[PDB]
Design a protein around this ligand. Structure first.
Ligand code: NAG
Ligand code: NAG
Ligand code: NAG
Ligand code: NAG
Ligand code: NAG
Ligand code: NAG
Ligand code: NAG
Ligand code: NAG
Ligand code: NAG
Ligand code: NAG
Ligand code: NAG
Ligand code: NAG
Lengths: 436, 436, 436
């Protein structure tokens, strides 16, 4: 376990405790995104912009169909999914799993494609199609709202050459937004790591409409959405009607048993007439009594749980392990030169303040609280005095659950470090000479 | 303090000198952002979209008020702001300061909330309300412009079922834009480090309107705005009318006395029949004769000053200070293999170039400029000849201010390094292996 | 030169082979971007917003003209381009080259400026003007389409105070979008490294319209566009009509002879009853039998080529070069702690899998595939059994081309490493302590 009391003297005050959960057991739903709007009522003087747009869009969608066909031509049934690796050549585990999912989805994709005329005939942003007697499929058109709201009502009040230019500009804007996702960046359409937010770029970035139409099945919807857990996969691309079929995955957030995330608050501390800040990860992941780093940039942090779409646990150095489990001397530290580093923190009702680097007096005492040159931090609870003053904040404090004689006991202190990108090169290069 | 001559002989040509500026003394103004538009004039067939949007927005905003209420409950002027830390539990210095500011703003927030009916009744993008007999408050409604410009005029030209769909799509787009900032990502709404641009996402990202309506208080407006110095804080959330109160901070740019930013220009140089580029920071902070690094990626680099919303000074390795103070050998270098690395530079009118890599000839005599094999760079000035050429550029040069015999004196050059992400891991691994 | 067979035993399975191509031989086109829209037809109720917008835009643009005038006043024909470095002061190689290009473009800029009245009289998003008897120039207005589609048609259906507010909001949104690029961030406007997508932010981000109107005539267009290969440069700023002149560069992709990019697929492998992953870059660049790294994150990855707007070759550690050329023991490895690390891969129809972590039972044999406690990965080809099963995927396999005794030969393995930044700091600091 983590030794919070020893970490506090370093400057690492214990923070909130959060539970760890990852995506599992995804459900599947199929949607059709029509990437070309219907212009039946505006065709009177739509000009020649549509042929150019179709050619440009075919130039984008052709690589997608080409990258799908390699798995399409190698997936079939033999006397489950039964693939042929000779004509596949290069494939990772994720690619092969995505191909299996693609073949599985083809069973419904065939019946979806059976309604090609209905898909093309759609002229609203969201349309319901009776895909079978007991199931339905929704159709999303990229720019149908804009055409039905702005361009169509203004088809005669302005010279419709200007309307042609406006439609061309709208389509060009849509394509420029698309090219970030569906352009040559999408080298691997056979994969399910593409988030619904990115897929909605084919719909103008309005993923909320897609999710609301499909259904808010769970109460953990927002955590799944922000954490990039709701993903989709393209399973069919049509170069005649210019539409794609996307299978959207709706997973459930499953708590990881015997696992939690502990956050450590860094506080500057005094040592040798100078201020220092400890260098340890802000978030530590504990799972089944095993301490390991978690890369938290991709994960989502809430008030009670950490939500990740993938198991983002990363290895932790053994020295870091002993720094977090009591051995303070192995805990690295950095000198502080900036004057905007926190100098006190409150945890469990008791504040850990660097009472020498900031004015520090209590309230009922009406006197100052003195921090000697040997103590890194000062523990202030209501044992010494029940209300403290720090700058312009007057705060009352609760009892401490740790050692009664905390402020009278010191510890060893670790060696200094520097964490700049180029400082790493200098340190490695310099000591290499020392090694020789 | 920086030895520019030796740095140039390394390949680090002295660049522009800029002053250091940080924000301080922030003035405060209060604005109200209503996140639900008024649909009174278009409620004839808006449908059930409004109730669903209200439910979604209530779900979005409930955690915000839940987090604010933790502090709002435990701060009550007692026998200055006087907070109870027992029920706060977990808090940092910045969070406690933000809570103090929140309570201070509550005194005016009470009078602002006294105008709940007026805030609800707003039907314009920007509305002026008399806070007091002398003070006024501006109300910003997110989608009011869109509704009043598009949905109201086109309320009967199109079937209003389509209008309901259009309004639903617009609100969904608004919510998708919001969820980046106001969604579960906003775990800590108490803190006041959220930029005005991010807050404007609740107003469609149009922070320029927010700032212009309040007032361009100073000529340093753009530097403050880009550097993220203009920040806001949510001080009250109402779920009955779905609006928030934001206290916008307008700091002033105060230059730090006896401090400046020095920029070094890297130039590839010849050494041992090959090309190298020195590995040192592009920007160097000198403050009160103390040299320190600066994570300038978060700051703004203008022509005459560096603007930072916080003091971003970070420590610099001692060896690196020795390198910048004259110790040539302690500066690391990287072998260059790219052919698109700069090979000459101009400072104070004197030309530093690597004539081995790029051909140099001098126009006033029409003969080549020769760089010998043991010289890193060639200093070319009008002392040598008034005009030299470099490929297709003909340039005239001033006089050097350093040593007259610059080109005849050599230095000691540093040790090679590699700066790739995996190179660090490989170097550490081998360097451990040698020690064992 | 790369020993794929030995890399497979580590877990680095050979992937796709791509060709390396860079920007070269850029063509030049001239366009005019007018950042103030023509509002002649809305002048009845335009209000006073236009004067304030003009003042804001003048404040935005004055630094740009000030920075251009440094090279404008210091460049003239001398008895090619002939610059004066005395009054330039500070300049890099890129800045000087950009200034030379700026002067070269001034010849056409004068003829463009001769049509100032025509430029300022434009009232459409894209307008064609004849700068000479033979050549023509296009004009792009930032917000003309929005005005002519929304504000003009709605000039009487709603009170024009609302129209004035709407125009002010639109201009403020346009300025908010602009300030990310054309604001104080644009410290060097002379340089030509700014992408066309960024330049289009002055046109609403519709770079597709610019490129389509300019008449592209290449099959490598999408690769050039994604890779940020198409760039522009501002060559003149007018503070009276508020327009800028941009010289757009259209290059050609030239394949680098004797150069290709090799991709390596990481696969978790068993060692000492534990699962590990190798720390080696995903992409390796080979040029004339010289191996080098590449920050391919800046580049674009396609199915058969890597496209970069600059030569992004970076040096590689010598030990690392030995690692990629058969010396297996120098390759670092990291202990897999997550349960979402790939565990099998397919290359050339040959399946590399870690049968310890994932059960393998190939259907043709009808029995499970057993991997011992000495073999890092198990090679499956149709010699041992044609079709293999891994979980839910049934795959048929080709024949190996390397050693037929692959599964019986073992290799040496490397030392463990950790890649976290804090882990790097802990590692570096710790062995300084042991070194002494
Ligand atoms: C378009 O034309 C059809 C007739 O084919 C008509 O039913 C419909 O109302 C028109 N408008 C829209 C928005 O579809
Ligand atoms: C897949 O098969 C189709 C015909 O069924 C063919 O047109 C296409 O080129 C094939 N794709 C390959 C072999 O990659
Ligand atoms: C300190 O505060 C706790 C509540 O947090 C209280 O129970 C205890 O009596 C207090 N001790 C004093 C006032 O001495
Ligand atoms: C390495 O150890 C020496 C011991 O004297 C110390 O002075 C130096 O600062 C240390 N450097 C690093 C980068 O750990
Ligand atoms: C470390 O020093 C040795 C001997 O001086 C040298 O051979 C080796 O290349 C150095 N390693 C570096 C600088 O990474
Ligand atoms: C704050 O106080 C109110 C009213 O007493 C209560 O409803 C709410 O739950 C409290 N919130 C806390 C204690 O976090
Ligand atoms: C709604 O209509 C009334 C009718 O007089 C008008 O006064 C009011 O300004 C309208 N509201 C909006 C927001 O347009
Ligand atoms: C050389 O350049 C200097 C500027 O540094 C100038 O003052 C001088 O007149 C030039 N010509 C000489 C020194 O002959
Ligand atoms: C350049 O010259 C013009 C007059 O020709 C002057 O107005 C401007 O200020 C000069 N700029 C600089 C940087 O000297
Ligand atoms: C303004 O109105 C005139 C009236 O004839 C028209 O010719 C011109 O095109 C209009 N300007 C526009 C639409 O930008
Ligand atoms: C393995 O597959 C290849 C074609 O990929 C075939 O030529 C060979 O005969 C097969 N070997 C066996 C034993 O079936
Ligand atoms: C250094 O090598 C030793 C060899 O026994 C190993 O135990 C230790 O973990 C290594 N540490 C680092 C930071 O590489």
């Amino acid at each position: 376990i983590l030794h919070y009391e020893k970490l506090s003297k370093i400057g690492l005050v214990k923070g909130v405790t959060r539970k760890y959960k990852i995506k599992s057991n995804p459900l599947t739903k199929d949607i059709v995104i029509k990437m070309i709007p219907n212009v039946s009522n505006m065709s009177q003087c739509t000009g020649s912009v549509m042929e150019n747009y179709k050619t440009r869009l075919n130039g984008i969608l052709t690589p997608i169909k080409g990258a799908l066909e390699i798995y399409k031509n190698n997936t079939h049934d033999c006397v489950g999914v039964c693939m042929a690796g000779v004509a596949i050549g290069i494939a990772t585990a994720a690619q092969i799993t995505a191909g299996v999912a693609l073949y599985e989805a083809m069973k419904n994709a065939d019946n979806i494609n059976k309604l090609k005329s209905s898909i093309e005939s759609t002229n609203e942003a969201v349309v319901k199609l009776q895909e079978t007697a007991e199931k339905t499929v929704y159709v999303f058109t990229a720019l149908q709202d804009y055409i039905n709201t702005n361009l169509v009502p203004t088809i005669d009040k302005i010279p419709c050459k200007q309307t042609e230019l406006s439609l061309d500009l709208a389509l060009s804007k849509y394509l420029s937004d698309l090219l970030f996702v569906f352009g040559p960046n999408l080298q691997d359409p056979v994969s399910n790591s593409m988030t619904i937010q990115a897929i909605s770029q084919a719909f103008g970035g309005n993923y909320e409409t897609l999710l609301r139409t499909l259904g808010y099945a769970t109460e953990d919807f927002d955590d799944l959405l922000e954490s990039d857990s709701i993903t989709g996969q393209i399973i069919y691309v049509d170069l005649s009607s210019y539409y794609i079929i996307v299978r959207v995955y709706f997973p459930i957030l499953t708590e990881i048993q015997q696992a939690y995330i502990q956050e450590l608050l860094p506080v500057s501390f005094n040592n040798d007439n100078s201020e220092w800040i400890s260098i340890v990860p802000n978030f530590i992941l504990v799972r089944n009594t095993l301490i390991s780093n978690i890369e938290i940039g991709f994960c989502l942090i809430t008030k009670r749980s950490v939500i990740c779409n993938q198991d983002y646990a990363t290895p932790m150095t053994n020295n870091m392990r002993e720094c977090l489990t009591g051995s303070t001397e192995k805990c690295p530290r950095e000198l502080v030169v900036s004057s905007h580093v926190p100098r006190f923190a409150l945890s469990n009702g008791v504040l850990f303040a660097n009472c020498i680097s900031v004015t520090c007096q209590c309230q009922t005492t009406g006197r100052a609280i003195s921090q000697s040159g040997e103590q890194t931090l000062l523990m202030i609870d209501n044992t010494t005095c029940p209300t403290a003053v720090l700058g312009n904040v007057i705060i009352s404090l609760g009892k401490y659950l740790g050692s009664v004689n905390y402020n009278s006991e010191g510890i060893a202190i670790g060696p200094p470090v520097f964490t700049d990108k180029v400082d790493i090169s200098s340190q490695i290069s310099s000591m290499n000479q020392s090694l020789q």
